[PDB]
Design a protein around this ligand. Sequence first.
Ligand SMILES: Nc1ncnc2c1ncn2[C@@H]1O[C@H](COP(=O)(O)OP(=O)(O)OP(=O)(O)O)[C@@H](O)[C@H]1O
Ligand SMILES: [Mg+2]
Ligand SMILES: [Mg+2]
Lengths: 341, 18
Amino acid sequence: GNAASVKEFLAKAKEDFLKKWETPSQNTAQLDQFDRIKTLGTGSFGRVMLVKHKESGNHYAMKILDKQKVVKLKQIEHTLNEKRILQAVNFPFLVKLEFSFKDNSNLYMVMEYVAGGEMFSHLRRIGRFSEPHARFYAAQIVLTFEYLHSLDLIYRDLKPENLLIDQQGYIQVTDFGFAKRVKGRTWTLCGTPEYLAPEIILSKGYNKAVDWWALGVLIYEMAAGYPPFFADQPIQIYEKIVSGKVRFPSHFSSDLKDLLRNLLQVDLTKAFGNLKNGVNDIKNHKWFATTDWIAIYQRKVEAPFIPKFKGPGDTSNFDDYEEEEIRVSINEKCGKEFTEF
Amino acid sequence: TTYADFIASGRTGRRNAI
Ligand SMILES: Nc1ncnc2c1ncn2[C@@H]1O[C@H](COP(=O)(O)OP(=O)(O)OP(=O)(O)O)[C@@H](O)[C@H]1O
Ligand SMILES: [Mg+2]
Ligand SMILES: [Mg+2]
């Protein structure tokens, strides 16, 4: 995202967001304006490829969604949410949507290419992050949720796989697939197993509190090297999540354990982020005592590590994926369903 | 150890959405 009182700042941010939310950008590029180079990653819904824009020579990350698959997996409204929200937001730690368009067969979202790779790859390779390292990333997520939640937005898919490291060593949140603008509670069963809050699993109405729960799981995983609740099958994971019992590694500081006990708390009346002081309860927690919040926002804090970059189109920080031809039918598919995309 | 149990589990690779 673009580089840099709180209430005043947020008021202006909401004004900017609403103008774009009410009148979304559309059809800002076309397929033949890019040369597709290689797949950077895939998920349950789309394929993200490194592409080069012909006229500018700039590299981007193009997310390709097969309309028919979107319908099959019942992600029509979710995908429309994804694009409408991403094109309207603006925060230092949110990936920027540069172009969006569609053709007979697919939907396309061209984002800034974040070359540092997924936090996931670095975390699994190194094993675990030191607490200062984990705290550096956590601070960026706390600020990002503060921003998103102020706009009545719930993210719903926080995980190392959806977090990218940029050239400066800072975080860039991607995959707004489950993002939604809602003022009340919502009920959709969505997210990723290890990060689902108890209320989602129990099919209960939930709110922004699930994002803070996810933050707790993310901090735990970053500092421990493994999730607080893991097993071989999702069902087994859900049973552990609902039990709520959490055990901490021997190296976790007392401050970190206290924070996690409050984030992964079953009592919503005591769960940090959803209390009277809201996000301030988190920002003022002892574990974040050394955190200079404004400096983080302004990206003035020294990053734990800067990813190795060889060139503008270097993809060495990403795994290799099997490639597939991107075909476009001569017949338009799901035209009316995605009219607003 | 918990770490050993995790590494021996079937979910140490990238996790896609439900
Ligand atoms: N802007 C980007 N720059 C670089 N790589 C990216 C970018 N956006 C996404 N990726 C990569 O592509 C992968 C797939 O994108 P994405 O997470 O949005 O797919 P998805 O289908 O929505 O996945 P999920 O199963 O989590 O819902 C990411 O995990 C990441 O590795
Ligand atoms: Mg994803
Ligand atoms: Mg997704």
